[PDB]
Amino acid sequence: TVVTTADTSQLYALAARHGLKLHGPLTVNELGLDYRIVIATVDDGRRWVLRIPRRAEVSAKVEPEARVLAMLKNRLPFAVPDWRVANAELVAYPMLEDSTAMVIQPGSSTPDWVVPQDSEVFAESFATALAALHAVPISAAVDAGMLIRTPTQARQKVADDVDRVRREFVVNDKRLHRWQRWLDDDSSWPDFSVVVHGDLYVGHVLIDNTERVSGMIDWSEARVDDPAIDMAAHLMVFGEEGLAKLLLTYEAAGGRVWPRLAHHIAERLAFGAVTYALFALDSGNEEYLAAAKAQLAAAE
């Protein structure tokens, strides 16, 4: 035989327990710390994504995320995963075959490709898609049992994350003062919350052949919270010029803005160091921890 990374017999049995008959090519990504991700061919001739929780604490998150996606399906003008299997041992959905807005080889630190800066179709359709997401009524989020943060709770969560990093790591003094100044800067913070994706960047956005946004994936961080959460990565990837274009079109599409939104988004992006450090800490992974500590101690 030939040794292969995927355990085809175990994967077949797992899928079959949930009404899916695997047959044909599959691909496996075991780099995720919480899930194994397999793209598999099923006897319907279609590819399906198998999202396999690794541990009980991850399995616990399946049921609430399933309620989120069930609520979002009809309320977004783009596709989201259709979790036709959702249980503690397996999530599975038909693959949304459109490409992500970037392409990267598993394990690599460098993408092969990112949708270009000058793609007006991408920029525009991402802005309108984001306005549509942020227009989902909070009532619908409450009815779906989502995590809800008022503006005060949103700001408290950021404070709590900063304080946890301060307890566990040694942070550059200027970084600490930046975060504290932000937390104390009333004019930066929004006076409302919206449904956010929570982990939104080009790698979780799907596009058609023309580069028009057609879907979003990986909704595990979705909640009602600060809208700027979903704009930080756009600034990170497309710069201030990209952000300026996003905010103009987002507002024109009905997105609610506030005067210091662009500033707030930059502060949220800086806060990404906190998010990364807590991910590292909770992961127990020494390589991620090494990177986090180095970033935190470094002057920005």
Ligand SMILES: CC[C@H]1OC(=O)[C@H](C)[C@@H](O[C@H]2C[C@@](C)(OC)[C@@H](O)[C@H](C)O2)[C@H](C)[C@@H](O[C@@H]2O[C@H](C)C[C@H](N(C)C)[C@H]2O)[C@](C)(OC)C[C@@H](C)C(=O)[C@H](C)[C@@H](O)[C@]1(C)O
């Ligand atoms: C351009 C392409 C590059 O993407 C980015 O830089 C995004 C803008 C990031 O989001 C930025 C912006 C941000 C707002 O997230 C969208 C912010 O939270 C974050 C930490 O970094 C990522 C997505 C981060 O992931 C996020 O890291 C979190 C700690 C946990 C998140 N999730 C729950 C599993 C996860 O998706 C990550 C750390 O990159 C550096 C992923 C890590 C594997 C890499 O270094 C990558 C190879 C990348 O540099 C990239 C793919 O080449």
Ligand SMILES: Nc1nc2c(ncn2[C@@H]2O[C@H](CO)[C@@H](O)[C@H]2O)c(=O)[nH]1
């Ligand atoms: N194009 C596409 N990629 C997916 C889909 N589901 C998962 N992926 C990929 O697998 C990762 C983990 O879910 C994502 O970040 C994507 O890289 C999908 O339906 N379509």
